[PDB]
Design an enzyme around this catalytic site. Structure first.
Site: not given
Lengths: 199, 213, 237, 195, 204, 83, 203, 233, 240, 216
Positions: J1-2
């Site tokens: 997840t960014q």
């Protein structure tokens, strides 16, 4: 980093310095910048160290497999081409290599330049490294095919000496190898600071 | 997108003697401007004749040793003997290279005895090149230790000096003095000093404190 | 018949049996016998070694699996070596993930899961091997027995050819084993294997192998010179 | 930057190439051969990005020799040039080959054939062609003096005028020049033109 | 522009019971002219040609794959292709590289092999079929060509005035495009014959 | 099926080299395909003979005959089938 | 974009605006923003317009077949977990904060806020959309433990009308829905029926 | 028909027994362990004078320190010896030392019973290797002899006979052996027992023999070096 | 017969003989019974120990397949551990996807389809084992499902599987399971296990018992030691 | 997840004589908004391991799912083994690092506390795999604001009684509430000892704003 090698009448003279750097910091002064392939072949170190060392060790494994299977040692033109075919696939991923393959085959002397850029050329004289440009000037003014052996030793050590003198990034110990028909032999290992007293 | 390394500091120090190898490390663990822990040793005993030093990113420092002890026990199964020091170095060079295009940000220094009872220090890069040395400093504070060891072990830039061999009692004081010099000037090194001496009898430890700031 | 129901493991014979599974147990009922047993502190294996020719040295019947587990073979040797590499991989994955060695009771259930799968799928054969597994963990020493994919927890157990007499001897003397020390424990198993031999052959320094694991002793195979104190001993037959 | 030149005549093709291999301020080879023999009647001149050139040229070369082994006769220069074009075109892939090519060939039935090709693998048959920045300085002389019925001595004279234009006006040191000619008697090596 | 790297200029124009198709002859790299006899129009039948302008290497790639697919169609089918089917085959072939597009905008000009109705169309570089009743133009001199062909085209012309109108519409358009020109070929497709002509044009 | 395959072979060649295929390469390619099914895969083999005529610029007018085993030969007159 | 669900005793009350803008041009001014996932389970769509329909079709597909197999009316927590799994699995390519509300016989009226992330949390009331920032302070002050159905409908209409007045990206009609055991009663508040708040005029 | 993985009522795989039956047709091999090294002797069994005898090779180099004898179906020993050489060179590549002979024999005997017709990574083996081997070498444990069979069961040896004339040559190797025997005496008795079992007449043309020492590498004997010990007969 | 070498082949009268031969292999193995009652499920298994060398806990025939679901098996037990691991993976995947404990009806109809999937193909053999599943929750009550190797699944008040199935089923039919507490149900379960036991053939056996119900708040647990031993005592004195 | 969106701030922890106490607030921020005010960020893994996580909250619920299913699948065997907290800590180090190696991290910074074999365990894992033990731990702004109080008390007195450690935790949480912008005055305390895991909460801190009268 400065390496040079040149063919002549009595074989191949290979000379190299020993300085490895980390930016402006010098990490080592005892780097073995000629990598021993087998009892008949030598490789050289310029640019990336581990990139040179892994592929030349695996090439030594490859030519030993070939000696076991085809019952004969490897030529220079085959072995350097296998090194080129190994390093050609990984263009553009950030590899850095400058190499010379030096051996004695049925064509006589052997000296081929292979890099991580993919170039593969023959030649009578070469010099690779960051301070290589200073090595060319000292090397080519004394170079001919009819060089005597000890004068070739003096020319090799003098060219590496002036290359180490001008380059901030080159230095260490002037290591000198000599490939003949019956195998390669170590000539000498000399500090730069002693040769400044000698010269 | 996820800046995937953090420089977690630390310096390690190895000296190859005539019949011993000394490996030292700090135990302070850092992250930019913070101190995580003050007791985290960086010297990891591999076999009876080899202790390894770690510096760099700490997650790879844990992962790589969990790989190496597994490979040692695979070797001890398949070959019915413990690995030599050169075998461990040659193994770890391939292990570090096989992660070429996402390297373990680890500077490995293998110290120990070879099979002939002499000290051998093998200092590595993250991408797997390796060389044998008599002494080596690594990690963060290497530029403060390495010229002083260049003075005192290689005896460079000294005239009228007898090049005496490496005795234990002078080398131990050398390790303590260079780490006091590193703790006085580098922020990353401090809070303890853990020293592993590899001799033929076995491996022992000595702990000295450093600066707390 | 005999003939069209013995050709596949995936054919139920009309009595409710599988003849290819029961024929795989003949491979463990022909092999050189082995004896396993434990105390509250130790677990020990005693095995005959098959050396093929008198100049050929002796077949390893005890295999290193980790510091804490060793196994014995009776039957198809290469299937047991396959299963040794499997158990090596499982203990190494448990050490790599959880940083504690895998408990033996779960590992032998994993072996029972692995050997079960060829006993049901067409074109495959059951593993023709029975094992005795000696291990030490948090729950103390263990002796297990695994062909038909079953696995048994055992106080003392002997598999192989002519093993019924060794099982009777261990049924006679299993009530002592918990409080014997390390030295007496292997002596009982040496007599138990000595029950299985023909009358003329004796237990020597060359044809008896021993593996020993304890609370602070890592697992070790006891061979030619190392078997001599445990051989001496000894109550004669 | 490497230089190429080729002239297609009535029953011959004359090609020449520079004999220099450079490395970023210095030249590292002064006897560099950029002419690779494909077969008895066909040469492929190969310049461009280093590494891509020799790998692509040898990969084409072993397939041409392999066709000769499978069939007992040679590729026509049209067929080998379209084969090289197809292999260079298959560009948008993970393996782009930034190579610049001239192919010279002689056929029994069609005669002398010269093919120009860039790194896009655009294939254009031309009576004369040239690569490099040195092409910009000598295609004008080739437009000045070339006629379709030039005999081979006027061809070596016009080539000598072109290489003297390289010596006088072009800024890269290109002192020595290898030349070959192809006709119905196979391949012929001619004397090196030096300055 | 990537389309303007080689130049290129092809157009068609519809007549009375005959069609005309012309193409520029310059094969170029952005400033340097290389040759002046580049082939852009390919025969795909007796009375059906396709002309491809744009990136010349995509012209030759699409023409080779199109001939590969069309020869299989005509051998398996046993007839000559009708031009609308060729338009859909070309649009299919270009749309298969939708996100990897060939840099060529082909035009198709020919005659129906049974009914001999004139057919003219062009495409974009990704495969939109555009059937027009007057003309289509393609290449880097599109504006120069539409300016000529909106004023010089008249409906129901004989092959002579069709030749004259497509000739002037090519010549004065390509004389205002720097990277195109250098000679032009004109193909007149008729009921009984094909007429292949080249014109006097500026060579600068 | 085989004469659907032959057209794909000949058009792959004409695609790749921009010249029409020599007459023997097509026959040896189809005999490679017919030979492959007689050895492995566990299928049944094709039961067809094919007579091959064709012109090329190398040897002109030619003739061949093929079998299910994958053999071929050059002929100036030959006959297959009944009698 | 302003959606709102309020839990009361015996069910939930949902509310939504009806203005879908692309840039600052109103692309649709009668948008229906309450999607029936099952009979008595509604999900609300704020954020990316494609994703909140495309995931909802997969969840409706899984939940109907699951309900047919189990011979049971499906739970609201099940319908929230099927979003919590799937919107988490593709959260890098979805911009989806869902407010699932509904009823089940087993646990009553339920409102699950699934924020952009693929987690799950039950709340007494949930507000979403771009306009919810302007009516956080209203609903923290007005909400009482245990409102009736009509008090919840007036509370949802007032809280939506405030956000439609202040937020430029919200407006149109108020579409309500009251989900309970008796069924779903939907209603639309248009023009004068929208609760009116006089401007702060100068005296 | 039945599978390659079918148990007999004795608990033996039929194919495993029949490969052992194919052992008993091969050229008989003799290898003997001494403290000065290991010597290995195999009979070439020349069938025709038109044959070049030097191109038959039934004793192979594995590495600089390991020899290997073979008996039976030498075409199986092609892929076995090539995987052995790749394993030794991978051990040199990885660990920068010589591979011990026990791990080599274990690696090669793993390839035995890696056969079967349902798991079938694309085109791997469908039948057992009908070759039995003798691995002779020197490592840090010293000179050693290992033995391997088509069951994949590998074991240590002091001297061993494999093949068609294995039976009496094993008992004669029981006769001559003592642990203080020298390498040259072992060459002598190995040629004695081979000349006892050869149908043809022994000279330097119809045998091969090599030695491995702690001092020197694996050294295949030349024709004159074979002739020199063969003069003793 | 020629028609019974494969599970993918019907006989001319419409029977699949590999499945009907596997249901002879089920009734080779020892007796396992389960009784559903008002507020929970109790399982009981005659556990033979073939030699007293064997430790306690070997060859358990009661498996936990979820934390609220237990399982009792009969037949070739090596297959039963495989079906236990299939049921464990199926209940784990249902908890992960749908967020709550799997209903026992749906779990039985997942595992019944996995069992049935082998009675169609010549490339596998049908499982040689029958098994029961029991559960309890506040919302669902107590439930008991039984699967035979044909794949067929139904819900039961009381069941007996194994080699003594009919004599045990007539004895379970004698009882009023519907209105008793589970602590009153273990004594019958233990009664019937020692009643149907063959004592002259295949001696030396052990009793194994577990329940799930409100008295364990839906958690599936073994019977404690004193309760199991006094059930053994009551059953031995009832046995005479 | 960014992109972390719903985040949790500092989690504390300190060993005491007989067990470990960790604490955490009950807020889920969404940028600057106090969006969720009654979430729990402390997980009870089994009877001798508790777990508190800072950072992204969705990844914490993914770890609650996976690490709960692991201990349930362990308890299904019923052989008498339970995961010691060192085993759960090693498992989390390997899972967080394996997610890091895919360039797809779990954006957390977690504190595992437990009490097994009479010995207290307190271990730190972040989203990179930097893992260690300490006598006291603090993630986020607790590492600058509450960590110095913990180590200042631990230097004078390395062994803490239970009530001393609980008040030291409460007095550090008061500091974080005074000086962290993303904290919230509603916090939990989880303590594992010989008897097992308890969670006490929601609690509140009592403020002192007498410096507000100290402007002029």
């Amino acid at each position: 980093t400065t390496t040079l090698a040149f063919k002549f009448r009595h074989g191949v003279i290979v000379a190299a310095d020993s300085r490895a750097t980390a930016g402006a910091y010098i990490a080592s002064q005892t780097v073995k910048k000629v990598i021993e392939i087998n009892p008949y072949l030598l490789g050289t170190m310029a640019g990336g160290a581990a990139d040179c060392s892994f592929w030349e060790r695996l090439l030594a494994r490859q030519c030993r497999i070939y000696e076991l299977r085809n019952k004969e040692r490897i030529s220079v033109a085959a072995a350097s081409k296998l090194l080129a075919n190994m390093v050609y696939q990984y263009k553009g991923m950030g590899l850095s290599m400058g190499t010379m393959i030096c051996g004695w085959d049925k064509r006589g002397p052997g000296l081929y330049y292979v890099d991580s850029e993919g170039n593969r050329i023959s030649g009578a004289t070469f010099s690779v490294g960051s301070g290589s440009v200073y090595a060319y000037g000292v090397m080519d003014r004394g170079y001919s095919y009819d060089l005597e052996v000890e004068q070739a030793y003096d020319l090799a050590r003098r060219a590496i000496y002036q290359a180490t003198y001008r380059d901030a990034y080159s230095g260490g110990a002037v290591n000198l190898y000599h490939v003949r028909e019956d195998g390669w032999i170590r000539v000498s290992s000399d500090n730069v600071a002693d040769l400044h007293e000698k010269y | 997108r996820f800046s995937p390394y953090v420089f977690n500091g630390g310096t390690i120090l190895a000296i190859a003697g005539e019949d011993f190898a000394i490996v030292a490390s700090d135990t302070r663990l850092s992250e930019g401007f913070s101190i995580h822990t003050r007791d985290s040793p960086k010297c990891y005993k591999l076999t009876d004749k080899t202790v390894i030093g770690c510096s760099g990113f700490h997650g790879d420092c844990l992962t790589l040793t969990k790989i190496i002890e597994a490979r040692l026990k695979m070797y001890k199964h398949s070959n019915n003997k413990a690995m030599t020091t050169g075998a461990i170095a040659a193994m770890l060079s391939t292990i570090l290279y096989s992660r070429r295009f996402f390297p373990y940000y680890v500077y490995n220094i293998i110290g120990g005895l070879d099979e002939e009872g002499k000290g051998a220090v093998y200092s590595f890069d993250p991408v797997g090149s390796y060389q044998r040395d008599s002494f080596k400093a690594g990690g963060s504070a290497s530029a403060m230790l390495q010229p002083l060891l260049d003075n005192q072990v290689g005896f460079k830039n000294m005239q009228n000096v007898e090049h005496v061999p490496l005795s234990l009692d002078r080398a131990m004081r050398l390790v303590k003095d260079v780490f006091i010099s590193a703790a006085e000037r580098d922020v990353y090194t401090g809070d303890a000093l853990r020293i592993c001496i590899v001799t033929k009898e076995g491996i022992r430890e000595e702990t000295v404190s450093l600066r707390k700031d | 018949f005999r003939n069209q129901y013995d050709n596949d493991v995936t054919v139920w014979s009309p009595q409710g049996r599988i003849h290819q599974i029961e024929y795989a147990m003949e491979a463990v009922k022909q092999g050189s016998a082995t004896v396993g047993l434990k105390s509250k502190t130790h677990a020990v294996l005693v095995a005959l070694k098959r050396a093929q020719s008198e100049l050929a040295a002796h077949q390893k019947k005890i295999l290193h699996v980790d510091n804490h587990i060793g196994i014995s073979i009776a039957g198809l040797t290469a299937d047991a070596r396959l299963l040794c590499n499997f158990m090596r991989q499982e203990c190494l994955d448990s050490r790599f993930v959880f940083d504690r060695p895998l408990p033996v009771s779960r590992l032998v259930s994993l072996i029972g899961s692995k050997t079960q799968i060829p006993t049901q799928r067409y074109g495959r054969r059951p593993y023709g091997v029975g094992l005795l597994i000696a291990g030490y963990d948090d729950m103390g020493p263990h002796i297990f027995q695994t062909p038909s994919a079953n696995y048994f927890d055992c106080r003392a157990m002997s598999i192989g050819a002519r093993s019924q007499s060794a099982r009777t001897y261990l049924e006679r003397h299993m009530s002592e084993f918990m409080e014997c020390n390390l030295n007496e424990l292997v002596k009982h198993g040496l007599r138990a294997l000595r029950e299985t031999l023909p009358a003329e052959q004796d237990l020597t320094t060359k044809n008896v192998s021993i593996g020993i694991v304890g609370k602070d002793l890592e697992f070790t195979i006891y061979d030619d010179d190392d078997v001599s104190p445990f051989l001496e001993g000894l109550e004669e037959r | 930057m490497e230089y190429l030149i080729g002239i297609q005549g009535p029953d011959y093709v004359l090609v020449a190439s520079d004999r220099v291999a450079a490395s970023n301020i210095v030249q590292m080879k002064d006897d560099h051969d950029k002419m690779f023999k494909m077969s008895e009647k066909i040469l492929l001149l190969c310049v461009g990005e280093a590494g891509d050139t020799v790998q692509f040229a040898e990969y084409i070369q072993k397939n041409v020799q392999l066709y000769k082994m499978r069939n007992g006769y040679e590729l026509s220069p049209t067929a080998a040039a379209n084969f090289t074009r197809r292999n260079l075109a298959d560009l948008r892939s993970r393996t782009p080959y930034h190579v610049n090519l001239l192919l010279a060939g002689y056929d029994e039935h069609e005669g002398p054939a010269l093919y120009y090709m860039d790194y896009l693998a655009a294939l254009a048959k031309a009576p004369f062609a040239a690569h490099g920045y040195g092409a910009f300085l000598t295609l004008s002389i080739l437009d000045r003096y070339y006629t379709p019925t030039i005999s081979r001595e006027r061809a070596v004279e016009l080539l000598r005028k072109c290489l003297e234009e390289l010596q006088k006006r072009f800024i890269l040191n290109l002192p020595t020049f290898s030349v070959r000619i192809i006709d119905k008697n196979g391949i012929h090596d001619l004397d090196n033109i030096s300055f | 522009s990537i389309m303007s790297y080689n130049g290129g200029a092809v157009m068609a124009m519809k007549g009375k019971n005959c069609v005309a198709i012309a193409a520029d002859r310059r094969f170029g790299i952005q400033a340097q002219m290389v040759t002046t006899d580049f082939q852009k129009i390919f025969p795909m039948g007796d009375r059906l040609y396709i002309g491809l302008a744009g990136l010349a290497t995509d012209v030759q790639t699409v023409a080779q794959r199109l001939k590969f697919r069309l020869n299989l169609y005509e051998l398996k089918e046993g007839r000559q292709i009708k031009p609308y089917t060729l338009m859909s085959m070309v649009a299919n072939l270009l749309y298969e590289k939708r996100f990897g597009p060939y840099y060529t905008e082909p035009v198709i000009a020919g005659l129906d092999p049974k009914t001999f109705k004139p057919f003219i169309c062009s495409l974009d570089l990704i495969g939109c079929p555009m059937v027009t009743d007057d003309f289509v133009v393609s290449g880097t001199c599109a504006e120069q060509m539409y300016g000529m062909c909106e004023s010089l085209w008249e409906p129901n012309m004989d092959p002579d005035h069709l030749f004259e109108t497509i000739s002037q519409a090519m010549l004065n358009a390509v004389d205002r495009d720097a990277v195109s020109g250098m000679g032009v070929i004109v193909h007149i497709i008729e009921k009984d014959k094909i007429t292949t002509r080249t014109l006097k044009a500026r060579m600068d | 099926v085989l004469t659907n395959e032959l057209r794909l072979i000949a058009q792959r060649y004409l695609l790749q080299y921009q010249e029409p295929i020599p007459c023997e390469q097509l026959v040896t390619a189809l005999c490679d395909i017919k030979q492959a099914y007689t050895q492995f895969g566990g299928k049944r083999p094709f039961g067809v003979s094919l007579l091959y005529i064709g012109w090329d610029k190398h040897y002109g007018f030619q003739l061949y005959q093929s079998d299910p085993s994958g053999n071929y030969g050059g002929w100036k007159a030959t006959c297959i089938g009944n009698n | 974009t302003t959606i709102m669900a309020v839990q009361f005793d015996g069910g939930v009350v949902l509310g939504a605006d009806s203005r879908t803008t692309t840039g600052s041009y109103i692309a649709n001014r009668v948008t229906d923003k309450l999607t029936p996932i099952h009979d008595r389970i509604f999900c609300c769509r704020s954020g990316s317009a494609a994703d909140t329909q495309a995931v909802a079709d997969a969840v409706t597909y899984q939940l109907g077949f699951h309900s047919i197999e189990l011979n049971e009316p499906p739970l609201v927590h099940t319908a929230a977990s099927l979003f919590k799994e799937m919107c988490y699995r593709y959260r890098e390519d979805l911009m989806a904060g869902i407010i699932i509300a509904g009823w089940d016989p087993q646990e009553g009226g339920q409102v699950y806020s699934v924020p952009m992330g693929g987690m799950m949390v039950r709340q007494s009331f949930a507000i979403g959309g771009s306009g919810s920032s302007y009516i956080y302070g209203y609903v923290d002050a007005t909400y009482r433990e245990g409102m009736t159905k009509e008090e919840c409908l007036q509370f949802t209409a007032n809280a939506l009308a405030l956000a439609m007045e202040r937020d430029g990206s919200s407006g149109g009609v108020i579409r309500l829905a009251a989900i309970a055991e008796s069924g779903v009663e939907r209603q639309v508040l248009l023009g004068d029926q929208i609760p009116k708040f006089a401007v702060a005029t100068l005296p | 028909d039945r599978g390659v993985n079918t148990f007999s009522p004795e608990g033996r795989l039929f194919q495993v027994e029949y490969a052992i039956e194919a052992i008993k047709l091969g050229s008989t091999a003799i290898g003997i362990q001494t403290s000065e090294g290991v010597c290995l002797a195999v009979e070439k069994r020349i069938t025709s004078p038109l044959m070049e005898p030097s191109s038959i090779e039934k004793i192979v180099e594995i590495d600089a320190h390991i020899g290997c004898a073979m008996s039976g179906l030498i075409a199986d020993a092609k892929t076995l010896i090539d995987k052995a050489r790749v394993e030794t060179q991978n051990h040199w590549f990885t660990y920068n030392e010589t591979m011990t002979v026990e791990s080599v024999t274990q690696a090669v005997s793993n390839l035995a019973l890696q056969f079967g017709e349902e798991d079938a990574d694309p085109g791997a083996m469908s039948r057992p290797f009908g070759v039995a081997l003798l691995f002779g070498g020197v490592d840090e444990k010293g000179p050693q002899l290992f033995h391997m069979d088509p069951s994949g069961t590998f074991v240590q040896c002091d001297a061993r006979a494999i093949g068609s004339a294995s039976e009496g040559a094993q008992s004669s190797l029981q006769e001559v052996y003592h642990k203080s025997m020298t390498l040259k005496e072992a060459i002598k008795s190995s040629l004695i027992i081979l000349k006892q079992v050869m149908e043809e007449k022994l000279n330097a043309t119809n045998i091969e023999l090599a030695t491995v020492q702690p001092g020197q590498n694996f050294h295949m004997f030349t024709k004159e070096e074979l002739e020199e010990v063969i003069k003793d007969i | 017969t020629g028609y019974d070498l494969s599970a993918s082949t019907f006989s001319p009268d419409g029977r699949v003989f590999q499945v009907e031969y596997a249901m002879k292999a089920v009734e080779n193995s020892s007796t396992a019974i389960g009784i559903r009652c008002k507020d929970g499920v109790v399982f009981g298994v005659e556990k033979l120990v073939l030699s007293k060398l064997y430790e306690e806990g070997s060859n358990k025939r009661l498996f936990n397949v979820d934390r609220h679901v237990g399982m009792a098996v009969a037949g070739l037990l090596a297959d039963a551990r495989s079906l236990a691991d299939i049921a464990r993976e199926e209940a784990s995947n249902f908890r992960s996807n749908f967020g709550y404990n799997i209903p026992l009806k749906h779990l039985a109809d997942r595992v019944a389809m996995y069992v049935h999937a082998y009675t169609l193909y010549s490339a596998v053999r049908p499982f040689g084992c029958s098994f029961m599943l029991g559960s309890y929750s506040v919302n669902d009550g107590a439930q008991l499902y039984m699967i035979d190797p044909s794949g067929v699944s139904y819900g039961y008040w009381g069941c007996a599987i194994g080699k003594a199935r009919q004599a045990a089923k007539t004895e379970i039919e004698k009882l009023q399971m519907k209105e008793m507490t589970c602590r009153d149900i273990v004594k019958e379960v233990a009664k019937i296990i020692y009643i149907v036991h063959d004592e002259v053939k295949d001696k030396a056996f052990e009793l194994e018992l577990s329940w799930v119900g409100e008295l364990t708040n839906g958690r599936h647990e073994i019977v404690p030691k004193d309760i199991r031993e006094e059930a053994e005592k009551y059953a031995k004195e009832s046995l005479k | 997840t960014q992109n972390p969106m719903v985040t949790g701030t500092s989690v504390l922890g300190v060993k005491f004589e007989g067990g470990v106490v960790i604490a955490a607030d009950m807020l889920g921020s969404y940028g600057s908004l106090a969006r969720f005010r009654n979430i729990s960020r402390i997980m009870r893994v089994n009877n001798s391991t508790m777990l508190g996580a800072s950072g992204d909250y969705a990844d914490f619920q993914y770890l609650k799912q996976v690490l709960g299913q692991m201990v349930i699948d362990e308890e299904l065997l019923g052989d008498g083994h339970s995961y010691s907290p060192r085993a759960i800590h090693s498992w989390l180090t390997r899972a967080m690092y394996s997610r890091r190696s895919k360039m797809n991290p779990l954006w957390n910074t977690m504190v595992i506390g437990g009490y097994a074999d009479g010995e207290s365990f307190l271990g730190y894992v972040d989203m990179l795999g930097v893992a260690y033990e300490a006598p006291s731990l603090a993630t986020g702004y607790g590492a600058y604001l509450a960590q110095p109080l913990l180590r200042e008390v631990l230097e004078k007195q390395p062994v803490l009684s239970q009530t001393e450690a609980r008040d030291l935790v409460e007095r550090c949480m008061r500091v974080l509430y005074y000086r962290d912008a993303r904290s919230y005055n509603r916090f939990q305390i989880a303590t594992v000892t010989e008897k097992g895991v308890e969670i006490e909460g929601p609690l509140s801190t009592e403020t002192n704003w007498d410096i507000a009268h100290m402007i002029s």
